[model samples]
Target chain A: EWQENKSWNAHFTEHKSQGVVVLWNENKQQGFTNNLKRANQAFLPASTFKIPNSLIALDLGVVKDEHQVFKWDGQTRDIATWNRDHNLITAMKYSVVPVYQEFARQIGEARMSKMLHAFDYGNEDISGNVDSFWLDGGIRISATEQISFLRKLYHNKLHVSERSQAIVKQAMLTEANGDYIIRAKTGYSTRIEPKIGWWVGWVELDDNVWFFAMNMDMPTSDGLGLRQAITKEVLKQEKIIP
Target chain B: EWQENKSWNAHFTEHKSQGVVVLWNENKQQGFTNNLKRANQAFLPASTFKIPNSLIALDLGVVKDEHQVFKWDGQTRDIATWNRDHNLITAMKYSVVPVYQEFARQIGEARMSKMLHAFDYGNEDISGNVDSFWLDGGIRISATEQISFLRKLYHNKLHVSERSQAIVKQAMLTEANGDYIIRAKTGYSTRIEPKIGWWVGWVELDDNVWFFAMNMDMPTSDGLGLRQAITKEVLKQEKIIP
Candidate 1:
C-alpha cells in the first residue's frame, strides 16, 4: 500500500504536471513514486540548492556556526523580506538569495565545484556564473536525485563530516510538534515560465523517518503552495504523521 | 462539531497571530470563529479589496466585461508578475495593483465612496487617496466584516446588479475538482512588520456553500502561505473536502 501508484494523484490533478519520490526504512531501500519518469527527469533544484550548499559551507568551515551572521548589503530585493542581515539559520529559514549568493562567492568556484562533485549531487554541473549556478545557470536534479541526496544526509553517509550534516539538518527544521520533527527546504526556479518548484526533505516521526521530494511546474507563484500542500497530504496518507 | 473550540488552533500555532471567521447556512445565521477578538478587529484588506472594487467597477459600467483590458504602462512594479497588460479577470487573478489603481482613478473618489456606502463594505470608508485607500489608507475591516460582505455577494444581496455579482464570482475561481469548487482571493498588506494577510472567499460543494475569511500576521512573505494553508486544512477538518 505504501508504494501504491497514483495514490496521490488526486492531490495534484489540476497542476500542469507533478512528481513525487519518497524513500524510507532502515536500509533506505523501500520507496514510492508517482510519475516515475518525471521523478527521474532532472530540473533545477532552485532554492533546494541551499540544502547542499549549506552543508558544504559548514563542512568546509566557511561559516563557524548557525549563529554566524552576514550583514545586509542594503540592496532591496523583489521579495521585500530578503533585504536584511541574516545568519546561516535565518538565511536558510527565509531562503535569502543575496545572503547565499555571498556565501557562494566566498566558497569560490574551485572549491564549490569540487564539493559538488564529491557529493555526486545531480550532474555536478556548476559551469556558469559562480554566484548563480544552481539557480538558473547550469545545474539540475530530478526528484529521485533529491531523494537519494537527502537519504544520504539522513543516514550520515555523505562524505562531509557528521557534524556538518547534523548542523544543516538542524537548520532546515520547519516544524516540530507533538512526536514529529520536520526538516525541509522549498525551492523555486523562476528562470523559466511555468517556474519549477522543489519541496524536498524528510519528516522524523517518533520511530522512523520519511524522506520525500516533490516537484511541479508552477504556472504562477500561487502554485508554490502545492509543493507543501500535496507533500503533507501524501505524508499523512502514508501514515507518516498522526 | 462545526463549533469545535481550539481545534483549528494547531493550524495557526506557527504564526505570530491569526483569526478566522466562517459564516454559512441559507440565512447566514450559523457560524464558527477562532480568536473572536481579532476576528472583530479591523485591518487593511490589501488585495482582498479587489473583490469589492471589481464589483463597484462592474456595476458603474467602468468596464464592459471581464474581457475589458487595461494596457500596461512602462512603469516597472515590485512584483515582476504585475507588470503586464491585464483584463479584469487576469487583473483579479494576479492581484495587479496598478490595474486596479487605474480602475479606482477612473471610478473617482465621489463614486467610489458612494459605492462603498451603498454596498455597506468595510465601514463604508474610502477616504484618503482614491487609488490606495484599500491598501493601507483609511479603510479597514474585520474578519467578521469580510464574511458578512461575502455572504451578501454570495446571496446576491449587494446593491449591484445580479450580473455584476455573477461575473465577479466567475472571476474568483481558484480551483474546481471533483465535487468541490474553490473561489478565493489572497491579500498581503506590507505596510509594517508582521505583515497583515487576508484569504477571503468561499467553497462551493454539491449541497452546501462555506463562506470563510482568514487573516494573520506574517513576519515575512514566506509566512504568507499560512493564509491559504490554514484555511484549507480547516475546511478539510470540517469534512468540506475529501
Candidate 2:
C-alpha cells in the first residue's frame, strides 16, 4: 500500500520486473515485489556447514554410531570433545567437531567431497573435497535442495543404509515431549561474538517427511544465550505442544 | 566388516544397523544387498538448530534480511557474553540466542513451524523446529543428514526469500583461502564444564558444493580442544589448497 501523494517525484518510472514469493503451502503463496531470490539459490553456509562434516564422519566410518563417545578438556576452546561415556548421537547433541574431524581425516577430503557431491553438494565444479569450498566457496544449498538430502536420510541414502535410516532418525528426536521425531543440528559463528545460529536437519511427523535449514542472526555480537533464547521462543510458539 | 568368526555376542547388537544412505545420481537404486546409510552417522550438531529460528524471523518479515541487526544489552555477564555493539549479523557471528529470541518473538513459532515445513522439515513426521541430540543421550547427526540441511540453505526456499538467503550465504563465509569459498561455524557443549565440541557448516567450492558436519565424542568428556583441532583438520583437508 503505497501512500498517496507520498512519492509523486519518488515514483513513476519503468522498473525491472522482479518480485518475491513466500509459500505457506500448496494453497498459500505470499508475494513481495521486493524479494529478489525468493525462489531458490545457493547460500554459503557458515557453522551450518558442519552439517556436511557430520556426513563425512559417518560415511568414513570414523565414529561407530551416534552413541560413540569422546572426551572433553576443561576449557571449552574446541568443538570436538564430548561427554565421558558419550556416543556419536550424544556428541552431536554437544556439537563436537574434533571427534568427527578425526573421522573425516580417515575418510579423507577426496572421499568426503565425493560423498558431498553424490548428495549434491556441488553442482559440478569441485576442485577437491577438502578444500574446494575453502578456495572457491562452492558449498551451497537451497530449501528444496535440503529437502532432497532429508529424503535421502529418511530413506537411508546418505551414509547409513536403508535399515539404519530409522535408527539415525530415532537419534534425531529431541526428547519424549516432541510432537514428532525431528533430526537437527545447530551452528553458531564464534569469532564475531554474538554468533550466527543455524538449524539444519529433518523431521518426521504425522506420516510426513521434511528437511529444514534455518539461520538466526542475533543483535549482540557476544550473547549466544540471547540467540538461543529466540530459538526457544519459536519452539514454544509452534505449540509443538511438547 | 565383522570377522567371520566374530563372538556371536555383541553388547548392543540392537544398536547396530545401516546409518543414512548415500544417494546415486544415475540410479537411485542400490545393489540388492547394499545398505544405504553408512558408518559415520553419529556426531554432534551442538546448537545449529538456531538456524531455524533465524529463518523463521525472515519468513515472517520480522527482519529485512540476514544482514538485519537486532540490538543488544551491553551489560557484561560471563566471559561468554562480553562482545561490543551487536546487530543481527554480529550476534549471529557470536551465536547470541537472547537477542535472537527477542526477534523470534516478533514472528513467533507459528511462523517458525511454517518455515521448517517449507524447508522440508517434518516431511517424515518430525515437528518442533528445535530438537537436540546429546553425546550423553543428546542430539546426533549423520554426515548424510547434515548435507540435507545444507542443500536447503544453498537455496533460499528455507527463509524470507533470496535476499535473506544471499545474506546468510555471505555471512557464513568467515575465511577464504582455497578454490572453494568456505563459510563455516562451530559449536561446543560446555554443560559438563567443557565436555564436547562441534564443527558443522557448509562450503561452496566452484561447481561442487560441500556441507560438512563434524564433531568428536569424548570418552573422558574432558577434551574440549579436540573439537577445534579436529574441525580445523577437516576444513584443512576439504577446503582445497593450491
Candidate 3:
C-alpha cells in the first residue's frame, strides 16, 4: 500500500525548496510519498553509491576485511577526515573518496558492472571513469530506488556474501540508543549544475524498521545539516523516532 | 494464519517430552503450534513471571534505573549468582530469585494485582503470596498466552511506560551478534508437582521479528537447558538465525 502525503509536501514548501522524501515501512509493507514531483526522479548518487561500491569490494575480496588499510597517496583532500590512512571502518565513517576510489580502481570496470547488474541497482550505469563515476557524475539513483536497494541489504537477500553484508551494515550504523538504531548514508552531488543533498537510512525500533530517503536542491549555503534536520522532523512526525 | 506443525510434534517425541511450543511471526502475523494438547493449557509461570514483574516494579519506580542496587542479606541463597548485591542488569542476567522476591514484597499485593490486570497477564491471578506467587503456585500462563504477552513487549504495546519497557527489554537481551539480537528468558518450576520448564523471547533481525514460547514437562531431569535446545533447533529450521 502506498499513500501520498500532502502535509509532508507542505513540509517542503515551508523550507522553500523542492525535492522528494520517501518512507517505506517494512512491517506494514507500505510506503508514504511526499513531494511526488521528484519521488521517482534519478539524480547523481554521490557518496551514497559508496554503499554498493563497498558491497562489491568486500564481496570479491578486493578488500580483505574491515581492518584492510588503504594507504594515503600523500595528496591533500578537502575533508579533514580523509587525509590519513583508513581501514574499511574509518573510510566508511568518513566517506573517504580517495579510499573508495582506490577500491574501485582495484575492482575494475567489468566486475563492478557485473555486480551492479546482479544487485539491480538503479540505472546500473557506471559508464563514467571507474574511480570518479559516482563522485563526479556517471551513475544516478532515485530516492525510491535507494529504498529498494536498502531493503535487499536489510533482509540479506542481496547477491553479496553474508559477511560482506554484515560488515557494511555495521559501518552504516550512525545511531544506536536504547530506544532505536539508525543505519544510513549521506550523499552530496556538488559537481551537478545545481547541487543536491541526500539522507538515506533505516530506523530499527522495537520490532519494526522504517526506511526513508530524502533529496533536496541545495542552491548555495551547503545546508549539510538540513538533510538530516528535515528528515528527523519527518521521522518524528510519523512517530518513528522520539 | 495458524499452522499445526506435526514435524515439530515428532520433534518433542524424540526428546521424550509431551508439551507445547508456539512460534509467532511478527512479520507475517501468523503462528505455528506443535503439540496442541497443552498449547492452551495453563501452568505456573514460575520465574517467567519476572518478565512482567520487572515491568511493574520499574513502572512504579521501585528500582531507580539499571544500576539500582539490592543488597544481599546475611543468609545465602541457592543460586550462587544470587548471594551478592545486584543492580537491575545483574539481577536479570543472573535470574536472581531473591532480588525479584524483594521486588514483589515492595510492590505488594494490591499494586501487583492492579499492574497484572493492566498488562492483561495470564489468569491475572496473584491470589497466592505476592512475594512467591509467580515462583510457587499463584498465577499461570499458557504457551500461546506467553506468545501473546511477548508480542506486546516486542512491539512496546504493553501498558507500562516506555522507560520500564526499555529497561526490561535491555535485561532480556541474551544474544546480540551482527546477524541478529535475541532477548529471552528461561524458567524452571521445580516447586510444581511434575515441574514445568519455559523459554520465551523474541528475535530481531534485519527488518523482522519472531516471537517464540516453549513449555515442556520437566519430569526427572531439571531440563534447564533442554528448553533452549529444542527452541533453537526450531528457530534454525525457520531460518530466523544463521
lDDT of 1: 0.78
Q: Which stretches of candidate 3 lie over 4 Å from their true place?
A: B1-242
DockQ value of candidate 1: 0.01
Q: Pick the candidate with the highest TM-score.
A: 3
Candidate 2 lDDT over B56-170, as tens digits, reads 6655677665434455476665546434545555555566756665665576546554665666542322233332222122445554455566667765545456555555554
Please list the residue runs of candidate 1 whose C-alpha ends up more than 4 Å from where it truly belongs after superposition: A1-242, B1-4, B14-17, B21-28, B192-194
Q: Which candidate number would show the highest lDDT if scored against the true structure?
A: 3
lDDT (10s digit) by residue, model 1, range B91-126: 877789998998899999999988888878888888
Q: What CAPRI grade goes to candidate 3?
A: incorrect
> By summed lDDT, which 10 consecutive residues of candidate 3 chain A come out lowest?
A170-179
Pick out the ten consecutive residues of candidate 1 chain B with the lowest summed lDDT.
Answer: B20-29
Off by over 4 Å in 2: A1-242, B1-44, B80-83, B122-141, B157-160, B190-195, B218-228, B235-239
Whole-model Cα lDDT per candidate? 0.78, 0.45, 0.82
Deviation from native of the Cα of residue A89 in model 2, angstroms: 38
Worst 10 residues of 1 chain A by lDDT: A19-28
RMSD of each: 23.1, 23.0, 19.7
Query: If you assessed candidate 1 against the hidden native complex, which CAPRI class would it receive?
Result: incorrect
The order of the candidates by TM-score, greatest first, is 3, 1, 2
